[PDB]
């Protein structure tokens, strides 16, 4: 699927 | 414990410009992907793009290309929606939607805010 | 654009019948759909993910198969809050698009 990239993981 | 607030409702004139914004509680903001999605009255439902509030980073539909900017403040936790140009096709209710964002990719959007009016007539 | 066609519109049935909704795409998508349901004056709210996993807190009666081009979401025994419509929707590729959506009302 699409994607934006990484995020702030936690 | 998941919750979008999205500011009030708004009255514009053709041609004028539109700024929704969506606040994010319960959750780390910059932990998924928004979308922004909008329901013109009695019709289906239209996406416009999303955004990735860690990065900044933006897709937006073609059709809105040009038109619709999305932008966010960490600070407040905070995503904003622009929309330019507007004319009567714009009339109806803007949604902004968390995605699940597994594998950081579109899975589904697991919470909704409320939604903003917004109506564009002379 | 991929779009997601969405059968039938409208549908009415009773209360504790099974009811299955179909939605076609135009173009392959894998396991890339998602399902939600709406009601008059309320946001959507996500039922399936992954095409077949259902969403966290929704009822099991609701359940969801299909893969590329074919897909069905089923109620096992609708109940009175079940009455709404449901719109499909795909994430494989931009723009991401919604079917057109199915209502579901109560037969009398």
């Known amino acids: 699927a699409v994607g934006l990239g990484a995020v702030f993981l936690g | 414990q998941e919750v979008l607030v999205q500011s009030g409702a708004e009255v514009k004139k053709p041609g004028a410009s539109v700024k929704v914004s969506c606040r994010a509680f319960?959750?780390?903001?910059?932990?998924?992907?928004l979308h922004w999605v909008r329901q013109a009255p009695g019709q289906g439902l239209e996406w416009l793009g999303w955004?990735?509030?860690?990065?900044?980073?933006?897709t937006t539909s073609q059709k809105f290309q040009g038109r619709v900017y999305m932008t966010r403040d960490k600070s407040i936790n905070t995503a904003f929606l622009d929309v330019t140009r507007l004319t009567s096709d714009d009339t109806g209710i803007y949604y902004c939607?968390?995605?699940?964002?597994?594998?950081?990719?579109?899975?589904?959007?697991?919470?909704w805010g409320q939604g903003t009016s917004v109506t564009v007539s002379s | 654009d991929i779009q997601l066609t969405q059968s039938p519109s409208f549908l009415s049935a009773s209360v504790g019948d099974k009811v299955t909704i179909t939605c076609r795409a135009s173009?392959?998508?894998?396991?890339?759909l998602a399902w939600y349901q709406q009601k008059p004056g309320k946001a959507p709210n996500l039922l399936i993910y992954?095409?077949?996993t259902l969403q966290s807190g929704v009822p099991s009666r609701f359940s969801a198969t299909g893969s590329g081009t074919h897909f069905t979401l089923t109620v096992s025994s609708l109940q009175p809050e079940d009455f709404a419509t449901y719109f499909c929707?795909?994430?494989?590729?931009?723009?991401?698009?919604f079917g057109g959506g199915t209502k579901v009302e109560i037969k009398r």
């Open positions: 992954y095409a077949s």
């Open positions: 319960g959750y780390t903001f910059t932990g998924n992907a």
């Open positions: 955004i990735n509030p860690h990065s900044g980073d933006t």
């Open positions: 929707q795909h994430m494989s590729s931009y723009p991401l698009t």
């Open positions: 939607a968390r995605d699940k964002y597994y594998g950081n990719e579109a899975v589904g959007m697991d919470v």
């Open positions: 173009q392959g998508v894998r396991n890339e």
